[PDB]
Ligand binder design. Structure first.
Ligand SMILES: Nc1ncnc2c1ncn2[C@@H]1O[C@H](COP(=O)(O)OP(=O)(O)NP(=O)(O)O)[C@@H](O)[C@H]1O
Ligand SMILES: Nc1ncnc2c1ncn2[C@@H]1O[C@H](COP(=O)(O)OP(=O)(O)NP(=O)(O)O)[C@@H](O)[C@H]1O
Ligand SMILES: [Mg+2]
Lengths: 440, 38, 447, 62
């Protein structure tokens, strides 16, 4: 808990630049009505906004309409970080584009009928990669901010030039950006995420500090767990969240290649990392590359492991490269790899407690049409020894029951399906019981 | 005129949002107190 | 389903406190008395939990509901029931004027006996009242500033009589130890078993039902099952279920304890095995229960001993040597099912098997609830939570959790107490409660 | 003598039988009336309470 962190809650008014706080909080924070504020949300995303004063707002909460939440990637009742933005320039020239489906017959009159009214004499702040929404005529239209002179944020004043030029932005390409995995799509691991950050991000971010107290960082890290726990996910997140250049080595993929091409790609990744450094090489499925040499009755397979050992070893401390790796079969990795200098530190991405199971379920239902009678906590308790995967697929099977309970109203032979019936569709508790009774 | 113009036109622009918020706030406050008996 | 459940009937009634505090007084509503063919101040047989009966004076009360019945503590205690149980009432038209009745007082309500009890307490109470009493009623009398509790030990004739002016009143013997009654109070019946309706139901219907209605089966041309086997892991409640079936059931019950039979000398075992089966055949309808069967009748392969095998044979031959008309059921129980000699689970022998398994969180709750009913629980205690926090836990485990909770709670007060005091400050005892954190501390020790 | 002694013994077995099983109406009623009158006195001391409670109900609900 801190002053500048606040719980997210819907705004009363629907203005795209408006973030409502309580007076006490504004005073505490040294903020005046209609200052410009930097909100920081999920996935590194920031939005820049106009703070205003609202009586019905709690001290610990903050109010914001969809369009802001979306661009902080947050949701109703997350926490966000707010701070003053006293640098904010009057923008010179800003490029905006509309989003391919919101506008059909598209780039006719969007300057005059939508944007100009919206922006004009309002002095709104906007940020690079804010997507916003404007209503004009009977239609509504979504506009991405592509670039702003100067970047990333500006105040759009009467003389700021407004470029409506380019190709309409595809829905798909912006949906792709929604599905990025970050540390918030991971449930029940604060303990470990914490460690990973401090073995990996902290010595790549502050290598001064460790040479300064006369200490060497850890440089080989190993995630292990049973399977379904979240290791492959934690890496996919680390990748999207981290400062460094990130090269991913997928075990079975390296081993799919031809005698020698493997060893090549192995080197290439270590070279490409040493080169772009500060870097994280991640090896998923380590067990598939570097098994216990006893078990592998093959010439080449042993050559690979050597090749790997020699790259691990062949890293000067000043390279600024971390190797993460991950496996479910720890004890089957060649013991050579967990020596000093190599995979020194190990992190148990274990089975989660009922708390974790909850977080997980909660993540996996956030985009899900849940009824009133659904008791996630309960499900969490009814699911002992379940892992991330298991619990996800449970939420699937729940929904695929819920859908199955409407197959009277639907046709498999229709081209697509009655919208009313889709909009209507909700996941009951009994859907969850039916699911639970299949996965036992 | 201008370097002052921008600042006053802006402050006066915010103070006008503030009004159109406060406008809502009371409408809602009164619907809360209208709710809690009704 | 598991369908052995209480049915509504006329003579079954819901228990509720009496208005007056008279120990022979059971208040009904007129309509009910009429429906039942009962007149004011008749003598009634109330039957309660654990085969307990009391015999009483029925009277008429207006504020009494039709489906309820009123009775002061002292009756409920002797029916072993509680406020809002159901009890069974029926006429007692045999009731003799008693000739001579032995009563005794209870040790801790007489500390410093003034020794005059015939005159101060009993005689006033009994005399010219014509109260009915039953063998093993414990009743309460106020005389002087003190109150005194008296057990009825025997009554001539027994088990009930009417105590009239000339019924002789024996105050002879040694004052009854509180203990030796609070042992009979804390004896187990079905209600002290948690998370097993499914199985209890079964047991009742493979055992009690054919012993109670052997007409019915010979009548639809069917043979009852006659060997039943309880199995589970250990801690689950098997040894408990038998101890309850015993206190609850119709039949003469003989218990054979495995390790105890095997503690005896070459031949004395085989004797006692016979003696039990004989004694049962003889008092029948009977239930023989064998606890720890695995300790008598292991897989003959494993037991490199002469006698051990002779015992199993002895057992087999008694099991087999039961005529259907004997009217005996053999229950037995074990935690190591697969280790019992396979000869025993044949036809004619232990035919049916009952899994007294690991309980679900619902069961775990019932269990925890049973284990804390005599326990000084705080407001912040969330039994339901604890039930959920305790996967794979069995009866035993949950009990000992509730012990360890309380032993923490006790440990949190050791500043206020002394190990070297003789007994302990009452205020501090009366004050003592079990918190939730006591339970967390417990949960974190048993994992 | 001994041809009479078993005839003699039987006879005085039937003299103790008829003596002991020889050796009501003026107490048969007393017991029943003293009892009915004993119950009908409990009935009173109950009814006595009943109304005292009925009136504390009606006193409670206002
Ligand atoms: N910690 C978690 N939080 C939320 N969802 C999870 C978590 N762990 C697993 N899941 C769900 O299940 C999927 C599979 O997990 P994955 O990332 O492959 O972990 P893993 O343990 O590396 N599996 P494996 O490749 O067999 O070792 C994830 O993408 C999620 O959909
Ligand atoms: N179903 C239950 N309901 C309530 N209490 C239980 C239950 N099961 C076990 N307990 C508690 O655990 C104690 C020991 O259980 P016990 O009756 O010995 O079971 P058991 O399975 O026969 N053990 P074992 O002799 O090893 O097979 C009982 O006295 C209870 O206090
Ligand atoms: Mg046992």
């Amino acid at each position: 808990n801190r002053p500048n962190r606040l719980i997210v809650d819907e705004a009363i008014n629907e203005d795209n630049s408006v973030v409502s706080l309580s007076q006490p909080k504004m005073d505490e924070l040294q903020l005046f009505r209609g200052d410009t504020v930097l909100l920081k949300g999920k996935k590194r995303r920031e939005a820049v906004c106009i703070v205003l004063s609202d009586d019905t707002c709690s001290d610990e909460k903050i109010r914001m309409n969809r369009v802001v939440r979306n661009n902080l990637r947050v949701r109703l009742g997350d926490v966000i970080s707010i701070q003053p933005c006293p640098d904010v320039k009057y923008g010179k020239r800003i490029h905006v584009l509309p989003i391919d489906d919101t506008v059909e017959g598209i780039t006719g009159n969007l300057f005059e009928v939508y944007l100009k009214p919206y922006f004009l004499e309002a002095y709104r702040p906007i940020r690079k990669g804010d997507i916003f929404l404007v209503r004009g005529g009977m239609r509504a239209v979504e506009f991405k901010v592509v670039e702003t002179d100067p970047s990333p944020y500006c105040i759009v004043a009467p003389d700021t030039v407004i470029h409506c030029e380019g190709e309409p932005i595809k829905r798909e390409d912006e949906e792709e950006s929604w599905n990025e995995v970050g540390y918030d799509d991971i449930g029940g691991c604060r303990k470990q995420l914490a460690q990973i950050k401090e073995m990996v991000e902290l010595p790549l971010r502050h290598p001064a500090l460790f040479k300064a107290i006369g200490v060497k960082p850890p440089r080989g890290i190993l995630l292990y767990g049973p399977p379904g726990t979240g290791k492959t996910l934690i890496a996919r997140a680390v990748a999207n969240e981290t400062g460094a250049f990130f090269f991913l080595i997928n075990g079975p993929e390296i081993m799919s290649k031809l005698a020698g091409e493997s060893e090549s790609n192995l080197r290439k990744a270590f070279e490409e990392a040493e080169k772009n450094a500060p870097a994280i090489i991640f090896i998923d499925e380590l067990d598939a590359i570097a098994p216990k040499r006893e078990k592998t009755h093959g010439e080449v397979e042993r050559r690979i492991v050597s090749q790997l050992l020699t790259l691990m070893d062949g890293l000067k401390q000043r390279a600024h490269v971390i190797v993460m790796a991950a496996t479910n079969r720890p004890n089957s990795i060649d013991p050579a790899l967990r020596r000093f200098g190599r995979f020194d530190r190990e992190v148990d991405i274990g089975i989660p407690d009922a708390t974790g199971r909850l977080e997980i379920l909660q993540i996996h239902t956030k985009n899900m049409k849940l009824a009133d009678d659904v008791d996630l906590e309960q499900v969490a308790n009814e699911t002992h020894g379940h892992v991330g995967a298991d619990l996800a697929a449970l939420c699937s099977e729940a929904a695929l029951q819920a859908i199955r309970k409407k197959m009277d109203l639907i046709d498999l032979e229709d081209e697509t399906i009655d919208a009313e019936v889709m909009n209507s569709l909700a996941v009951t508790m009994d859907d969850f019981r039916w699911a639970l009774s299949q996965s036992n | 005129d201008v370097v002052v113009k921008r600042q006053e036109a802006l402050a006066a622009a915010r103070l006008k949002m503030q009004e159109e918020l406060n406008a809502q706030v009371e409408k809602h406050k009164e619907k809360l107190k209208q709710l809690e008996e009704e």
